[PDB]
RNA sequence: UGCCAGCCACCGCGGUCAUACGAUUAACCCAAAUUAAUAGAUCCACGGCGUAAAGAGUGUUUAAGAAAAAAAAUCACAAU
């Protein structure tokens, strides 16, 4: 969300976010189901599915997002461009 | 076991292909008449396909035959020989309007 | 609220899932109806790529043996005298009559084209139809 | 309240409940020219499974499949009507514009045949009003807009989680359409046919709902 | 019961073959000043101009004789992925339904 | 104090209202240690080569390799 005032953009991006929601399927409600590797534009994310105790070892943004999803155990290495939106 | 289903034949209806005025004629440098048809009367230029309307093959045969005639001394270069002025006009150009 | 991603799944998918997550607290009408008699294909978004290389479509062109006959008919006699009525569901044209006659004389075993064709023309002249032909 | 759950649940258990099987046939569709599509030069890639083939350059839709689908679309339409929900006929084609507006008004259903304002579905509360109900179903009699791109309402109905019935001609893109029925949108007997069918389905459903309501009232 | 294939195979529109130079019957469903909108039963209507001879005999509902050229007017143009439809058919108006 | 005096690993700070200099007050962080300097450990491409560094002006063979399933050498036109 984007605005002249910081406060304003905060509001805008919140209220807009709630409109695009995904459902993320969680295996046993902690990990993902299986290993994932994706090249999105110039960013490569590579994630691996962990056992119960191995908490959230990830780029800090991914940890943030995971904590929001409910994914508690994960390993992800991002390579190529680390640009945040991508 | 449905007999009403379509049969994978080639198109029966398909038309024949259109033909250059000359398809399977023989262009020969020796007859300046046929050649002199595809020239501009005033200049002596050779007309293009978009005027003569020929298979690329024949437009080529015509060009080569023309130039050959012109240098072996059968046919004049700078103007269409006046004798052949009143022969049939095959080409699509209109000068006088 | 809901999910405005058109590309991610079917509306069914997104809806059911958003209910599953406990976000969407009221089931929408069309949902129960949907579950009951779902469509043939999942309405998931798809991008229409242009084909390339040697690839072509699978679509079959529609031809029947009768066509193989009709062509000779039209080459010979042009379109028939009776015109055409594309409103009348049972309408038979002059070409179609000629076809049926040709097929019947095929069942007598004459394998020559000329015999079949000309004799079907005669069998048609019998019924009173005029074939004016063309040069 | 329990028997209201009865009145909503009951019709789901039969396949035919409004008996719409008998409103059309493959021959019925065939005479309305529905099986006729555009030239093969215009054919949209995603339509090929619905083509019976191509006759001399024309694409002939496969009616067996048109029937299969149409049965489903009508069924769905009807059940939405019975459940008292908003149906929106949408077409931007100026021949049938009047025809469709008429049809809709006769079913007690709504029509948008005109220019589709930008945020109509996505930003509803600004265009229409402070709080609003949005259509529960949207029927497209033509999936295209007069510039030959897909009608906006398709992308935005999808965007809004609204299920969509629509008649997809041979050059349309069916992908985002919930229950597509392949067939001819251009010719008059076809559009008149589809209008009449959706009309009858709606009316029949609203009746059945009235009658079953009456029955529920005499039950106690 | 009749399979769709069976219907398609016998229909008058299949009987015609190629639609070039075919004599057909058509009916006028709409009029603007000199423009007759003629439904000949195929897919798209054609549109022809009201002739000079017996101009007033052509009215909505009338029947006329057409010479069909093209069932749909369509072409691909430079730089386009798909063809362009005019959404019309090409016909020559001959006379009206001599009867 | 005033583009001076000075500061910084990198971005940078100092021109009269400096949280960046110098000192004070408060705080933070390590702790019998704490900073600085220098050497290591670690770190480059199983990635790339139209426009960013990069397909070498052209073809043939040598060496070396690949053969991994199905076939082919060949006819209007301005090669030399
Ligand atoms: Mg169409
Ligand atoms: Mg210092
Ligand atoms: Mg100061
Ligand atoms: Mg500092
Ligand atoms: Mg200091
Ligand atoms: Mg020490
Ligand atoms: Mg370069
Ligand atoms: Mg090179
Ligand atoms: Mg060089
Ligand atoms: Zn030729």
UniProtKB/TrEMBL annotation, chain A:
It comes from the Eukaryota. It is found in: Mitochondrion. Belongs to the universal ribosomal protein uS5 family. This is Small ribosomal subunit protein uS5m. The gene is MRPS5. The chain holds residues 259 to 344 of 430 of the full protein.
Automatic annotation (TrEMBL), chain B:
Its main location: mitochondrion. Coiled coil: none annotated. [2Fe-2S] cluster binds at residues 20, 23, 55. One of its GO terms (biological process) is translation. One of its GO terms (cellular component) is mitochondrial small ribosomal subunit. One of its GO terms (molecular function) is small ribosomal subunit rRNA binding. Keywords: 2Fe-2S, Iron, Iron-sulfur, Metal-binding, Mitochondrion, Ribonucleoprotein, Ribosomal protein, Transit peptide, Zinc. Zn(2+) binds at residues 20, 23, 55. It is found in: Mitochondrion. The keyword RNA-binding does not apply. Belongs to the bacterial ribosomal protein bS18 family. This is Small ribosomal subunit protein bS18m. It comes from Sus scrofa (Pig). The chain holds residues 47 to 143 of 143 of the full protein.
TrEMBL record, chain C:
GO terms for molecular function: structural constituent of ribosome. Its main location: mitochondrion. It is found in: Mitochondrion. Keywords: Mitochondrion, Ribonucleoprotein, Ribosomal protein. Residues 16-128 form the Small ribosomal subunit protein mS23 conserved domain. Belongs to the mitochondrion-specific ribosomal protein mS23 family. GO terms for biological process: translation. One of its GO terms (cellular component) is ribosome. This is Small ribosomal subunit protein mS23. It comes from Sus scrofa (Pig).
Automatic annotation (TrEMBL), chain D:
Keywords: Metal-binding, Mitochondrion, Ribonucleoprotein, Ribosomal protein. One of its GO terms (biological process) is translation. Signal peptide: none annotated. One of its GO terms (molecular function) is structural constituent of ribosome. One of its GO terms (cellular component) is mitochondrial small ribosomal subunit. Mg(2+) binds at residues 38, 169, 185-186. It is found in: Mitochondrion. It comes from the Eukaryota. Belongs to the universal ribosomal protein uS2 family. Required for mitoribosome formation and stability, and mitochondrial translation. This is Small ribosomal subunit protein uS2m. It comes from Sus scrofa (Pig). The chain holds residues 55 to 274 of 289 of the full protein.
